[PDB]
Structure 1
Amino acid sequence: KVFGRCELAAAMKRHGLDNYRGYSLGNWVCAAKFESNFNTQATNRNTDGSTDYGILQINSRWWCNDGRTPGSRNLCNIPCSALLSSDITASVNCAKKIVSDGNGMNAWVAWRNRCKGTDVQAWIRGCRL
């Protein structure tokens, strides 16, 4: 599924991401835009052989099991394939654990590089929430 901007903002809010660990909804929508372009099926291989999955490009190195990331963990207790569903529940649940890990949204390098400090409210401007 490719979400619309206000559609994803609505789904993230309903799943309780809005102000989760103090991060406004606009931060999560900005992160998703640059990680996945709002595509739940997005996959990207890392140099270390781990893979990133779904709207929020969650890494098999720590968070999900894909069966091909040697010496990795599965701290969200899910197959990485669950992070590609049209239903964003698994991605949101796993993102809540990641952002609680101690470095907040800095865990998402694209959030640090492209969203952090910017007018993130623009990402939910005109959305019926």
Structure 2
Amino acid sequence: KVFGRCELAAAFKRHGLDNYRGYSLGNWVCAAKFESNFNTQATNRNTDGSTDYGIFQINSRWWCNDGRTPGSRNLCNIPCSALLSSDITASVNCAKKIVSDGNGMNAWVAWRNRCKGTDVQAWIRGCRL
């Protein structure tokens, strides 16, 4: 499923992401935009053989099991395919664990390079929330 900007903001809010660990809603919408273009089905393989899944591009080396990443830790205890569902619940529960890991949202390279320090409030502007 390809989410609309405000539709995703609303889903994120209902799922308790607004200000989770101090990160406002605009931060999460901005990260989803640049990581997957709001597409739950997005996947991308890395040079190390691992693969990134879903809206938040969660990595198979540490967070989920895809059956083809030697030494995956599967910290979110879920098959990576679950992260591609139109129901964002799994993606959200796993992202919450990732952001609590100690590096905050820096864990997401696109967030660090394209959202961090920018006017992220623009991402939820105009939305009924």
Classify the TM-score, shorter chain: over 0.9
Partner Cα separation in structure 1 for residue 82 and residue 8 of structure 2: 17
Deviation at 1:79, TM superposition (A): 0.4
Deviation at 1:8, TM superposition (A): 0.3
Deviation at 1:25, TM superposition (A): 0.2
Deviation at 1:72, TM superposition (A): 1.4
Query: Deviation above 2 Å: which 4+ runs of structure 1?
Result: none
- Report the 3-state secondary structure (helix = DSSP H, G, I; strand = E; otherwise coil) of the residue aligned with 2:55: coil
User: Please, what is the CA RMSD of the aligned residues?
Assistant: 0.3
Partner Cα separation in structure 1 for residue 60 and residue 72 of structure 2: 7
Deviation at 1:71, TM superposition (A): 1.2
Give percent identity, aligned residues only. Answer: 98
Calculate the TM-score normalised by the size of structure 1: 0.99
Q: Deviations over 1:87-110 (max 9, x none)?
A: 000000000000000000000000
Structure 2: runs of 5 or more not aligned: none
Partner Cα separation in structure 2 for residue 15 and residue 49 of structure 1: 31
Partner Cα separation in structure 1 for residue 99 and residue 68 of structure 2: 24
Deviation at 1:48, TM superposition (A): 0.4
